[PDB]
Coordinates of C-alpha atoms and ligand atoms in Angstrom, one line a residue:
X1 CA -18.3 22.0 15.6
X2 CA -15.7 19.4 16.5
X3 CA -12.1 19.9 15.4
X4 CA -11.4 16.1 15.3
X5 CA -10.4 16.2 11.6
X6 CA -7.5 18.4 12.7
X7 CA -6.1 15.8 15.1
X8 CA -4.0 14.3 12.3
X9 CA -2.0 17.5 12.1
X10 CA -0.8 17.1 15.7
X11 CA -0.6 13.4 16.0
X12 CA 2.7 12.1 17.2
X13 CA 4.1 8.5 17.1
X14 CA 4.8 6.4 20.2
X15 CA 8.4 5.4 19.3
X16 CA 9.5 1.8 19.9
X17 CA 12.5 1.1 22.0
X18 CA 15.3 -1.3 21.0
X19 CA 13.7 -4.3 22.6
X20 CA 10.5 -3.7 20.7
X21 CA 12.3 -3.1 17.4
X22 CA 14.0 -6.4 17.8
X23 CA 10.7 -8.0 18.5
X24 CA 9.2 -6.6 15.3
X25 CA 12.2 -7.6 13.2
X26 CA 11.9 -11.2 14.5
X27 CA 8.1 -11.3 14.1
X28 CA 7.8 -11.0 10.4
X29 CA 8.9 -13.8 8.0
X30 CA 9.8 -13.1 4.5
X31 CA 9.8 -16.8 3.5
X32 CA 6.2 -17.2 5.0
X33 CA 5.1 -14.1 3.1
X34 CA 6.7 -15.4 -0.1
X35 CA 5.0 -18.7 -0.1
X36 CA 1.6 -17.8 1.5
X37 CA 0.9 -14.2 0.4
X38 CA 3.0 -13.5 -2.6
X39 CA 3.2 -16.5 -4.9
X40 CA -0.6 -16.9 -5.1
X41 CA -0.7 -13.3 -6.6
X42 CA 2.0 -13.9 -9.2
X43 CA -0.7 -14.5 -11.8
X44 CA -2.3 -12.5 -14.7
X45 CA -5.0 -10.4 -12.9
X46 CA -6.1 -7.6 -15.1
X47 CA -9.6 -6.2 -14.3
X48 CA -12.4 -8.6 -15.1
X49 CA -10.1 -11.6 -15.6
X50 CA -10.3 -14.9 -13.8
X51 CA -7.1 -14.0 -12.2
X52 CA -8.6 -10.8 -10.8
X53 CA -11.3 -12.9 -9.1
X54 CA -8.7 -15.4 -7.8
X55 CA -6.5 -12.6 -6.4
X56 CA -9.4 -11.0 -4.7
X57 CA -10.4 -14.3 -3.1
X58 CA -6.9 -14.8 -2.0
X59 CA -6.6 -11.4 -0.4
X60 CA -9.9 -11.8 1.4
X61 CA -9.1 -15.3 2.6
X62 CA -5.8 -14.3 4.0
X63 CA -7.3 -11.4 5.9
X64 CA -10.3 -13.5 7.1
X65 CA -8.1 -16.1 8.8
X66 CA -6.6 -13.5 11.1
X67 CA -7.7 -12.9 14.7
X68 CA -8.1 -9.1 14.5
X69 CA -11.6 -7.9 13.8
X70 CA -11.2 -7.0 10.1
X71 CA -14.3 -5.9 8.3
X72 CA -14.1 -6.7 4.6
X73 CA -16.0 -4.9 1.9
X74 CA -15.9 -5.4 -1.9
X75 CA -16.5 -2.0 -3.6
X76 CA -17.8 -3.0 -7.1
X77 CA -18.7 -0.5 -9.8
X78 CA -18.9 0.1 -13.5
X79 CA -16.8 2.4 -15.6
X80 CA -16.3 3.3 -19.3
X81 CA -13.0 2.0 -20.6
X82 CA -11.3 1.9 -24.1
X83 CA -13.1 -1.5 -24.4
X84 CA -16.5 -0.3 -23.3
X85 CA -18.2 -0.5 -20.0
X86 CA -16.5 -2.9 -17.5
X87 CA -16.8 -3.9 -13.8
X88 CA -14.1 -3.3 -11.2
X89 CA -13.9 -4.3 -7.6
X90 CA -11.8 -2.5 -4.9
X91 CA -11.1 -4.5 -1.7
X92 CA -11.3 -2.6 1.6
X93 CA -10.3 -4.1 4.9
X94 CA -11.0 -2.0 8.0
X95 CA -10.4 -2.3 11.7
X96 CA -13.0 -0.3 13.8
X97 CA -15.2 1.0 10.9
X98 CA -16.9 3.6 13.2
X99 CA -13.6 4.9 14.6
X100 CA -13.4 8.5 13.3
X101 CA -9.8 8.3 12.1
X102 CA -7.8 5.7 10.2
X103 CA -4.2 5.3 9.1
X104 CA -4.6 3.8 5.6
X105 CA -2.2 1.5 3.8
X106 CA -2.9 0.8 0.1
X107 CA -1.7 -0.6 -3.2
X108 CA -3.3 -1.8 -6.5
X109 CA -4.0 -5.5 -7.0
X110 CA -4.8 -5.5 -10.7
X111 CA -2.0 -6.3 -13.1
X112 CA -1.6 -4.4 -16.4
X113 CA -3.2 -6.0 -19.4
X114 CA -0.9 -7.4 -22.0
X115 CA -1.7 -10.1 -24.7
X116 CA 0.5 -13.1 -24.1
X117 CA 3.8 -12.5 -25.9
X118 CA 6.0 -15.4 -26.9
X119 CA 4.4 -17.6 -24.1
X120 CA 5.2 -15.0 -21.4
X121 CA 2.5 -13.5 -19.2
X122 CA 2.8 -10.2 -17.3
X123 CA 2.4 -10.7 -13.6
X124 CA 3.6 -7.3 -12.3
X125 CA 5.7 -8.7 -9.4
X126 CA 6.8 -5.3 -8.1
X127 CA 3.7 -3.7 -9.7
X128 CA 2.1 -4.5 -7.3
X129 CA 2.0 -8.1 -6.2
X130 CA 4.8 -7.4 -3.7
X131 CA 3.1 -4.4 -2.1
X132 CA -0.1 -6.6 -1.8
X133 CA 1.9 -9.3 -0.1
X134 CA 3.6 -6.7 2.2
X135 CA 0.2 -5.5 3.4
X136 CA -1.0 -9.0 4.0
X137 CA 2.2 -9.9 5.9
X138 CA 1.9 -6.7 8.0
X139 CA -1.7 -7.8 8.9
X140 CA -0.4 -11.2 9.8
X141 CA 2.7 -10.2 11.7
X142 CA 1.0 -7.5 13.7
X143 CA -2.2 -9.5 14.3
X144 CA -1.9 -9.9 18.0
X145 CA -1.3 -6.2 18.5
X146 CA -4.0 -5.2 16.1
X147 CA -6.5 -7.5 17.9
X148 CA -6.1 -5.2 20.9
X149 CA -7.8 -2.4 19.0
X150 CA -11.1 -4.4 19.1
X151 CA -7.1 8.2 20.2
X152 CA -10.1 7.2 18.1
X153 CA -7.8 5.9 15.5
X154 CA -7.4 2.6 13.8
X155 CA -6.1 0.9 10.6
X156 CA -7.6 0.4 7.1
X157 CA -6.1 -1.5 4.1
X158 CA -7.3 -0.7 0.5
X159 CA -6.4 -2.9 -2.5
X160 CA -7.4 -0.9 -5.6
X161 CA -8.6 -2.5 -8.8
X162 CA -7.9 -0.9 -12.2
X163 CA -4.9 1.3 -11.3
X164 CA -3.4 0.5 -14.7
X165 CA -4.5 1.9 -18.1
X166 CA -6.0 -0.8 -20.5
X167 CA -3.9 0.9 -23.2
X168 CA -1.3 3.5 -22.4
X169 CA -1.9 6.0 -19.6
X170 CA -4.4 8.7 -20.1
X171 CA -6.7 10.7 -17.8
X172 CA -9.8 8.6 -18.6
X173 CA -7.9 5.3 -18.9
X174 CA -6.2 4.6 -15.5
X175 CA -6.9 4.8 -11.8
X176 CA -10.4 3.4 -12.2
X177 CA -10.7 2.0 -8.6
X178 CA -9.1 5.0 -6.8
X179 CA -11.0 7.7 -8.7
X180 CA -14.2 5.8 -7.9
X181 CA -13.4 5.1 -4.2
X182 CA -12.1 8.6 -3.5
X183 CA -15.3 10.1 -4.9
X184 CA -17.4 7.6 -2.9
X185 CA -15.5 8.3 0.4
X186 CA -15.7 12.1 -0.2
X187 CA -19.4 11.8 -0.4
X188 CA -20.0 9.4 2.5
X189 CA -20.6 11.0 6.0
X190 CA -18.2 9.8 8.7
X191 CA -18.5 8.9 11.4
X192 CA -22.1 7.5 10.9
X193 CA -24.6 10.3 11.4
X194 CA -22.1 13.1 10.9
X195 CA -23.5 16.4 9.5
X196 CA -20.5 17.8 7.7
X197 CA -17.5 15.4 7.7
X198 CA -16.7 12.6 5.3
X199 CA -14.7 9.4 5.2
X200 CA -12.0 11.4 3.6
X201 CA -11.7 13.7 6.6
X202 CA -11.2 10.5 8.6
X203 CA -8.2 9.5 6.5
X204 CA -5.3 10.6 8.6
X205 CA -2.7 9.6 6.0
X206 CA -2.7 7.5 2.9
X207 CA 0.5 5.4 2.7
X208 CA 0.5 4.1 -0.9
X209 CA 3.0 1.3 -1.8
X210 CA 3.8 0.8 -5.5
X211 CA 6.6 -0.7 -7.6
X212 CA 8.4 -2.2 -4.6
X213 CA 10.6 -5.3 -4.8
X214 CA 13.5 -4.4 -7.0
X215 CA 17.1 -3.8 -5.7
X216 CA 18.3 -0.5 -4.4
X217 CA 15.0 1.4 -4.4
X218 CA 15.2 5.2 -3.5
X219 CA 11.9 6.8 -2.3
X220 CA 11.8 10.6 -2.5
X221 CA 10.0 12.8 0.1
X222 CA 7.3 14.0 -2.3
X223 CA 4.9 16.2 -0.2
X224 CA 5.5 18.8 2.5
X225 CA 2.3 17.8 4.4
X226 CA 3.6 14.3 5.0
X227 CA 7.3 15.1 5.2
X228 CA 7.4 14.6 9.0
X229 CA 6.2 11.0 8.4
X230 CA 8.8 10.4 5.7
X231 CA 11.4 11.6 8.3
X232 CA 10.0 8.9 10.7
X233 CA 10.6 6.3 8.0
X234 CA 14.1 7.5 7.7
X235 CA 14.6 7.3 11.4
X236 CA 13.1 3.9 11.7
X237 CA 15.3 2.6 8.8
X238 CA 18.4 4.2 10.5
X239 CA 17.7 2.7 13.9
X240 CA 16.8 -0.8 12.5
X241 CA 20.1 -0.6 10.6
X242 CA 22.2 0.5 13.6
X243 CA 20.7 -2.4 15.7
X244 CA 21.8 -4.9 13.0
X245 CA 18.2 -5.8 12.2
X246 CA 18.3 -5.2 8.4
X247 CA 19.9 -7.6 5.8
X248 CA 22.5 -6.7 3.1
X249 CA 21.8 -3.0 3.9
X250 CA 24.0 0.1 4.2
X251 CA 23.3 3.7 5.1
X252 CA 25.0 4.9 1.9
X253 CA 22.5 2.7 0.1
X254 CA 19.5 3.6 2.3
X255 CA 16.0 3.6 0.9
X256 CA 14.7 6.8 2.3
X257 CA 17.0 9.5 1.2
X258 CA 17.0 13.2 1.8
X259 CA 15.6 14.2 -1.6
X260 CA 12.4 15.5 -2.9
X261 CA 10.7 15.1 -6.3
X262 CA 8.8 18.1 -7.5
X263 CA 7.3 16.4 -10.5
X264 CA 4.0 14.6 -10.5
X265 CA 3.6 10.9 -10.6
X266 CA 0.2 9.6 -11.6
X267 CA -0.9 6.8 -9.3
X268 CA -3.8 5.8 -7.0
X269 CA -3.1 8.6 -4.5
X270 CA -4.0 11.3 -7.0
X271 CA -7.9 11.3 -6.5
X272 CA -7.2 11.5 -2.7
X273 CA -4.5 14.1 -2.8
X274 CA -6.6 16.4 -5.0
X275 CA -9.3 16.1 -2.4
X276 CA -7.0 17.1 0.4
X277 CA -5.9 13.8 1.9
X278 CA -2.2 13.8 3.2
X279 CA -0.3 11.1 1.2
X280 CA 3.0 9.3 1.9
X281 CA 3.8 7.8 -1.6
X282 CA 6.0 4.9 -1.2
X283 CA 7.0 4.5 -4.8
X284 CA 10.6 4.5 -5.9
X285 CA 12.2 7.0 -8.3
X286 CA 13.5 5.8 -10.7
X287 CA 11.0 3.0 -11.2
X288 CA 12.4 -0.6 -11.3
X289 CA 14.3 -1.4 -14.5
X290 CA 11.8 -4.2 -15.3
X291 CA 8.8 -1.7 -15.1
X292 CA 6.0 -2.8 -17.5
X293 CA 8.1 -5.5 -18.9
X294 CA 7.6 -9.3 -18.8
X295 CA 10.8 -9.3 -16.6
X296 CA 8.8 -7.8 -13.7
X297 CA 8.7 -11.2 -12.3
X298 CA 9.5 -13.3 -9.2
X299 CA 13.1 -14.0 -10.3
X300 CA 13.9 -10.3 -10.4
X301 CA 12.6 -9.5 -6.9
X302 CA 15.2 -8.7 -4.1
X303 CA 14.2 -10.7 -1.1
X304 CA 16.2 -9.0 1.5
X305 CA 15.1 -5.5 0.4
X306 CA 11.4 -6.5 0.7
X307 CA 12.2 -8.1 4.2
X308 CA 13.9 -4.8 5.3
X309 CA 10.9 -2.7 4.0
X310 CA 8.4 -5.0 5.8
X311 CA 10.3 -4.3 9.1
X312 CA 10.3 -0.6 8.5
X313 CA 6.7 -0.4 7.5
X314 CA 5.5 -2.6 10.4
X315 CA 7.4 -0.4 12.9
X316 CA 5.9 2.7 11.2
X317 CA 2.4 1.4 11.6
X318 CA 2.8 0.3 15.2
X319 CA 4.3 3.7 16.1
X320 CA 1.5 5.6 14.3
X321 CA -1.2 3.6 16.1
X322 CA 0.6 3.6 19.5
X323 CA 0.7 -0.2 19.6
Ligands
LIG1 ZN1 2.3 -0.5 -13.6

């Protein structure tokens, strides 16, 4: 009876030295991400809408053009909603599908439904078009290194549909894509042919990005079983800062501060956390001032903060994967 599902508990990062950190900082481009990955997503894309289809095609196309051996799957399903039965489609992009373990980065790609108001349309720039674009930029910036994966551990990206409630949040109206996928993964043997382990046992850590893009975000260390990874993000931010590799950034105004948050935040990690998956929830507290407002747009995004977070996240992923 293999103890492989316990490997995640002892897994240590392979820390990048200064030269490698400079290489990662120089290898990501916030302007390229902005034009090629982010702007095409700054559209109305609530579940079932034409924009949802366009966003999904965009995400798939951007991953498909990369060299690394990404395996794309569209997880489509029906669910009851306040408006009756509707169809949703999660996007899953996986390197090494049969590898037993995967580090998983995720965000939601749907935008909250709002009827047009005074000619304005809700595009959820920080919620979560930026997180989507950060995951796509990470895949592009680290493409050569990820290609080398073609430690039975690899990388998976999940773009959840239906994170938002169609009305106001409630237990049955929200997290459509994540409740469905968590249940599906929990009931899917992994690796292929396994007798008693599931795809959830294979999830080393779920790093969920949400509401990123506003100025001065502060991310709390939410869970004790991922606290050591939160500390790594703090260390990475501190070293990139000391090396002069971050922009318009100070340690007093750092993003990963020594502070927990005992409350519960409802988001896509919930269906996974309640099934025992370790979660690193990269959501700020408090939420952006523009949260669920028509002002959650491109104009209110903080470019350098997103650039800094791209660097931190890419270093974190390479260190986790030993790349
Ligand atoms: Zn939202």
